[PDB]
Amino acid sequence: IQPNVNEYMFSNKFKARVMVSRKAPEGVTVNDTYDHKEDILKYEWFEFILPEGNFSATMTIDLMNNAIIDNYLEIGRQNGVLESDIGVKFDTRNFRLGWDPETKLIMPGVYTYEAFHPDIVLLPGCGVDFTESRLSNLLGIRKRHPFQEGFKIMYEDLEGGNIPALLDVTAYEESLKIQPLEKDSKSRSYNVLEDKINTAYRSWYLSYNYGNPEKGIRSWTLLTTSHVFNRFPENQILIRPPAPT
């Protein structure tokens, strides 16, 4: 027959923009008195190749994430990029289930971890480009307009899809102290976004279903049917997505 992922069908490539370097401006000479909020963040595009084969649908998302992380291992971390800065992460869960209207946090302190639909999560300055890729159809994310040249979903395009912050359940129980979770185990930042309600990560599935129907990503996208892969088991954003079993 023919494998589900091969170069003839163009289902092994996809372009994505990720953070490349994090360096203080000029000669700051980063010391104790450095804010680290003035770091210069440079982003860049790359074409990510996956091996060929069948690769299911969840295993496809596992390999797509692995391609992003391989780039971070090659150029990313060596130029000051943190694990808190990995922008492109492909997930399958609803990041808004634990949300509470009064606190506007997710009280369970953990995202639901139940597979619903393939998703794209991004950090500011990042994005994915499926213009020359057929992996979008495999993720169940297609253009709402068939004749729309290009299919580039980026961070600026996902208005209203910010992943809510996790409740600091430990502080809450130590009482009430309804506090957002700033970091995780191993002290890598969740990016709490100052408003103390949401994170800097933006989910496509959130902007589609919980965002503005017009002037959002739903306006021109369509939701259709679809420990090396869990390098960050403690991070609730970067954890291996659940499988629809």
Author numbering: 7 to 181, 195 to 245, 283 to 301
Report text from the authors:
Adenovirus-derived nanoparticles (ADDomer) comprise 60 copies of adenovirus penton base protein (PBP). In the ADDomer, the PBP monomers spontaneously assembles to form a pentamer, and twelve pentamers organize into a dodecamer characterized by high stability and thermotolerance exceeding 50°C.16–18 The PBP monomer folds into two distinctive domains; the jelly-roll fold domain which is located in the core of the dodecamer and assumed to be responsible for multimerization, and a solvent-facing exterior domain, called the crown domain. The crown domain comprises two highly flexible regions, called variable loop (VL) and arginine-glycine-aspartic acid (RGD) motif-containing loop. To expand the scope of ADDomers for new applications, we engineered ADDobodies, representing PBP crown domain, genetically separated from PBP multimerization domain.
To validate our design by high-resolution structural analysis using X-ray crystallography, we created an ADDobody prototype with minimized loops, called ADDobody-Xtal, based on the assumption that long flexible loops could be detrimental to crystal lattice formation. During X-ray diffraction data collection and structure determination, two different crystal forms were observed: In the absence of zinc ions, ADDobody crystals adopted space group P1 and diffracted to a resolution of 3.17 Å. In the zinc-free ADDobody crystal form, the VL loop could be manually traced through the density in some of the monomers. In the zinc-free ADDobody crystal form, twenty ADDobody monomers are found in the asymmetric unit. Of note, five ADDobody monomers formed a penton in the crystal reminiscent of the ring-like arrangement in pentons formed by the PBP in the ADDomer. Two such penton rings in the zinc-free triclinic crystal form a barrel-like decamer where the VL and RGD loops are outward facing and accessible. The Coulomb potential indicates a complementary patch of negative and positive charges at the ADDobody surface which contribute to penton ring formation in the crystals. Specifically, D106 forms a charge-charge interaction with R83. The stacking of the two penton rings is mostly mediated by van der Waals interactions, with residue F153 playing a central role. A cation-V interaction is formed between F153 and R140 of an adjacent chain, and F16 could also interact with F153 of the neighboring ADDobody polypeptide chain.
